[PDB]
């Protein structure tokens, strides 16, 4: 009998909590190619003539 | 006259600041940035006799902190290479007489 609606409220709360999300990410570098090149003294002059 | 007379000691002496591109696997923007930095830095650090290795710790120095850390460049009058590169990485330009410029970031 003492305890009342306007003595005792009865409130509800929670807080917002953002739902759980498992994702994946593979991150692969630039592909890196052989070059082989070769220089001589005429090869040179030839571009450059 | 014109290219008869013209011989390899007369063309070597008429035009040493000459620019001559022999491969390209780098991007058309990043190449008109390196080229500008290496023909300046080569022609202060040519000295009165044209120190390689003076050359090369500019050329290295200025292009690790212009673009990524592990930058290898080498110079040389003939050479022979086989050099794994990442992709659009690389230049390879010659200076005018017997001077072989390969650089690329690794």
Known sequence: TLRNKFNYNTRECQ????SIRERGVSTEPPPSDTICGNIT???????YY | KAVTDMDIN???KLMIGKAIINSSDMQGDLLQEAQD???SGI???????????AACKYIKENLDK???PTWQCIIGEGYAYD?????NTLLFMFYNGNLAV???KS
């Open chain 1, 15 to 18: 807080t917002i909590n953002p």
């Open chain 1, 41 to 47: 003294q005429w090869e040179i002059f030839d571009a």
């Open chain 2, 10 to 12: 007369e063309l070597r």
């Open chain 2, 37 to 39: 930095v290496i023909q």
């Open chain 2, 43 to 53: 022609e202060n650090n040519s000295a009165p006799v044209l120190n390689i290795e």
């Open chain 2, 66 to 68: 212009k673009f990524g």
């Open chain 2, 83 to 87: 050099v794994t590169v990442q992709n």
């Open chain 2, 102 to 104: 390969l650089i690329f």
